[PDB]
Amino acid sequence: VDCSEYPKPACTLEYRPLCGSDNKTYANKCNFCNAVVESNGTLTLSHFGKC
Numbered sequence: 001v002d003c004s005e006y007p008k009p010a011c012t013l014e015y016r017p018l019c020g021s022d023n024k025t026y027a028n029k030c031n032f033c034n035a036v037v038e039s040n041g042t043l044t045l046s047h048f049g050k051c
Contacts, residue, residue: 003033
């Protein structure tokens with residue numbers, strides 16, 4: 001997914017779960033992309049929905 005507009009200082013509460021390569025279910029794309037940046041690009045997206 002496109003994380004180009006990240007990191008963002010806040011994420012909304014809109015619950016659109018997606019499963020990281022870490023097996024964490026991120027709450028939405030904002031939370032996921034912020035984690036991608038924090039990971040220095042090690043975290044990828046496995047799939048949409050819960051892990």
